[PDB]
Amino acid sequence: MGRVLPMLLVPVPAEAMGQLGSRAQLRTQPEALGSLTAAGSLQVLSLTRGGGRCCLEGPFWHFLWEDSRPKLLALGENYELLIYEFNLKDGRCDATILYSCSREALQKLIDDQDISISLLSLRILSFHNNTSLLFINKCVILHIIFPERDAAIRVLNCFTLPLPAQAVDMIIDTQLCRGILFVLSSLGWIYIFDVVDGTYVAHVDLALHKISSFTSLKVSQDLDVAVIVSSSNSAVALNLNLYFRQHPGHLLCDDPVNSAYNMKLAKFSFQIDRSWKAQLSSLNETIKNSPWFQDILKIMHISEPIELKCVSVTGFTALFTWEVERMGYTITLWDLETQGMQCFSLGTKCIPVDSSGDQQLCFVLTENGLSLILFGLTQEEFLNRLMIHGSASTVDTLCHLN
Amino acid sequence: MVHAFLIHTLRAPGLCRVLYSCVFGAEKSDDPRPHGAERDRLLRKEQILAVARQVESMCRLQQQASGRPPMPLHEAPRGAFRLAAENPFQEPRTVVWLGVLSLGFALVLDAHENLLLAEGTLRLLTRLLLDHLRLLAPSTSLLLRADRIEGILTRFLPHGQLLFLNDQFVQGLEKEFSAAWP
Amino acid sequence: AFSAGAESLLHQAREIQDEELRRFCSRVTKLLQEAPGPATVDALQRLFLIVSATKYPRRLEKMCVDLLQTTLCLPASPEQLQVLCAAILREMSPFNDLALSCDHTPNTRQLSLVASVLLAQGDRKGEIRCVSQRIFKILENRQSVRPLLPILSKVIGLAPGILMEDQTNLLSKRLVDWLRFTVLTEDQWVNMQAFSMLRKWLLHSPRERLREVAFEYCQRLLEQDSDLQKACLVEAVSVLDVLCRQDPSFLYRTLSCLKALHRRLGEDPGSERALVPLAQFFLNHAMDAEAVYGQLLRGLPSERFHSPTLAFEVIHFCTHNLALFDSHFLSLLRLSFPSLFKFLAWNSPPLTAEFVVLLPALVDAGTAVEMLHALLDLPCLTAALDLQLRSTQTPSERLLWDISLRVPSCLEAFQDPQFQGLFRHLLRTKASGSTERLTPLHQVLKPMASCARVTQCAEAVPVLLQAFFSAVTQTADGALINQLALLLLERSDSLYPVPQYEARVHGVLSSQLLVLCKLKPSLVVELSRELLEFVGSVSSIHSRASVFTCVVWAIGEYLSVTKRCTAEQINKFFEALEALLFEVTPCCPPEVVTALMTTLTKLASRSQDLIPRVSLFLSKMRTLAQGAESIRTRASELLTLLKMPSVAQFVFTPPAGVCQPRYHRDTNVAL
């Protein structure tokens, strides 16, 4: 029983949906909804009334809004990275270009770190506090910083991947999750490095977990569960602590006098204060009672999604996005602890909007507009919880809007 | 088997510190740290000290809750117990005791050893230690004269093994040891 | 005994200064190389004391160590010095500097000393194999061999296979030729050693003549001179059982031997300990359920419960072969539990850490309703056995009992015909039907209920209760649940007044009735009458000050609208609660007041009319209130939070998943 709870907290007509792109991403606050058109124009539908569209034209094929858990930063076809700011004041979809970077300057900064490699491809990894991490040439994890006072972009760190060039150039994903920078190689390994120091703090054997071509991997915000989605619409999730311990070979991460000796005799270790009154507590405790990242300071196959990019993964849940032209959008939710899945089919005019923030409920842009898809919440239950939370005005609004 | 023979103090109804702790064997031992001496010695000492504390607890509780002349061959407190793995032994073992005055001599014996033989042998040994050495006032004769204990056990208790000695065989061993010391 | 001079000597041996240690090592050097006389022993004794009494390592000057090793290698040394040096090198172990060798002294007794030196090292440098091989090579010539056999035995104790097959068969033939008289010359001298390790040899590892003589020598230690006879009967039975283990045909032979022995072993006092190995042999290869096993389970413990080592043997046999228990054996051990409780009454310290394992291994379907009472009346069991001793013993032998406390009232009450059947149920050897409350016998045994042994038995009942409940809380159905609830409701304030006993049974029973209620929420619903009478009585809060909180909390929370429930039950329970609150406001503690407020205000928010009743009476109670502060504040959670009905209707009856830490983050995902 997982059909829908498809609410809508702001409308958006299909006139703009006929102009937006196929994929989009939303700020945590309602700041924008920018979508990528196949023509290279960056359309921004401000869902913060009426909702006009803004256009940013160029050879842009990669961008990411400021995910401060909108300041759009994009890199063109000539490996020139730009930062343009859009202001949603009073519904005015007006944008301005603030910071621009040229390919010659990027190659110069790469060479100044004694890296004898010409920049052939730059793929983004993050954009936080005006500091961007980029996996340059798929090998050098150069942590740029665009500071205040128009300071030049200087790499505050540049550590070559402690791996041979055989697998260094086969990297796919560069995910920063609270500092444990993971770089996935398409052959089935994840070299968990640390952006602070650059050490190969650990290594994960995705092959030992037993297809191939790991397209992307999702890290829980607590570095607790990681789910890797390949290019074959297959996702597998295993626990970092268990996957580092249960295969620890791959993990590179009179009163006192006898008691402290129990602390240093380590072949065994007593449990010593050997009376016949405190030996009952041991029996009582036995009857009654009967992670990996600490050192580094089923399967989803819908019986073919185009881009099976899971939106976010929590400690006990996992939400994914799948879009198909034949039938529409299929949104999936996986419970990490309960191993349950809820997959709902939607209409053929709807695309995801990656909420680059804290609210990990699938906010799908439907024909009428914004739509937050939930599971298990009845309309009566939801409105009752709002009323038990606030006034009846909110209940009236949420009941009337649909 | 017998892992060890003991002489230890027994409190009256001050830690119980073994006056004589003869460990009749070793244990297999491997830590990634190179095989040391502090670790093994401290382990083989703390095990015996824990056995001594357990026998003290058994003896004291037997003393209060017996009523038998509270505070002599068959008139001394006696009993048995079982130990706990990793606290601090590997293979679990039974513990046999027989306390006289304030000198409770124990035996840590494997579960494949006779209990009644263990109690009889501990009784004969504690008679021999009370008489041959006669420490019923000069208790210094038990620590500065540990060689007498060493001789007695080396004669009667060869290498952690109990013998079914009878009158003729005890006569033979008496002919053996009696004159070896003045 | 224990002289302060002895303590001073030990303290001096422990805290000898490093410079003083170097001086003593130099003295040893200048005194051992010299003419070793009485000064040699007078210094070696002090060296042994200063090395032995120090747990932390004492690696003194090397010269002393090499001097000791060479002295062991020096044949002119006397027996005393050689033994003391062997102790020196068998105590200072284990050292990685083992300059010693395994073929350094020709003397056989000195060879034994060298073996004792070597074996105390460990497998850190492949030592044990070297010592075993060297011993075999030294024994390869004519031997004698009798002195060195204990080293062989200890080696196989610590190393089961390094004795090669050829060497193993050499040892076997040597022992067989060494078998042969009996306890009841050099030949008999080696016979004693052959008998002294037979069981370990068989476990770790002519033959027709072996079966003729040595195989029957196991029983010949007993069958084929009083204390050694007892010490040897057990060895004979254990060796017979070992032969059964190594030879399946020997199981029948040992069973027949035990059956033949049953003429006296079942009728000879002072020989009861030999049946424990017989019981083990029967279990691994079942004895007479009535005579032999009957005495082992219920016959022996009612006559000889005052021997602290026999009881250990019995209960350890019971808990060491529970894995291989059979259905009939399970029924037997489930039948005689009140008698098995006699040992826990008398010999608790060495047997409770053993019942904790045994109790979940004899749980039956309906015995729990009586087993709780059997656990409840255990200190009284000890007191009744004490009276039994005081009134049947000849004054001559009476030392094997307690006759040193207040006799006259209890002894008179023993002969009082008012209590001639209840004692025969408390002291019973069986439980085949529940008995009456022990209140009368509790008033009888006031004088002795504070004995040392009764106080001993009182401390092993809480843990056994926890074991039994945890074995039944996972093995319960509706009838069992209701019976147990009624049992606790009765026994709340009906206990033997042994000091610090009811304060523990109360805690276990109350906090586990909570566990039963959380196992089935409808317990309060099906238990209207009893709980209603209990809450309506002030005396319940005036004598059960720590169980009343539990029942009032359960009633306040488990009056849930969401098929046997009726709308008027809430009103009847509210009537009981209102009466209790009016009357009440060890008496009711500052916990009962707050729990009563909680129950009233959270039970009147499930009734439409009773909200005005709250506004009239619970509001009045708040105003009068406006552990007392908690009483005043608690009711707000269903006065202010139940004034509004929509929110209050559901919180107090939450779903099944408010506990697991991720079940609701999507329930605020509806905006």
Place this chain on the structure above:
Amino acid sequence: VSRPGRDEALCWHLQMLAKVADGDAQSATLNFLQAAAAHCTNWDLQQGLLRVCRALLRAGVRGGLVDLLQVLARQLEDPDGRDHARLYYILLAHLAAPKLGVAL
């Protein structure tokens, strides 16, 4: 909160903890309270502890408390304290900020 929480004066610590807890130093307080959860066997400390949780309630702290209150409700001794925690956890998890001050 400096001590790990193994003292015998816990019944005296929790009173200050309740009288002072707010939304400034979250993680340290949550860790200390989690450690102290195992050292509460009598009703008095089991009410001081939920007095602390109620103080946090009133302060308005939201995240992580959905687990601190949860663990307190799931791992105490007396039923009354556990029900107290359940009610207060529900109040914090399902209320808007003002209504908690008006309906709790």
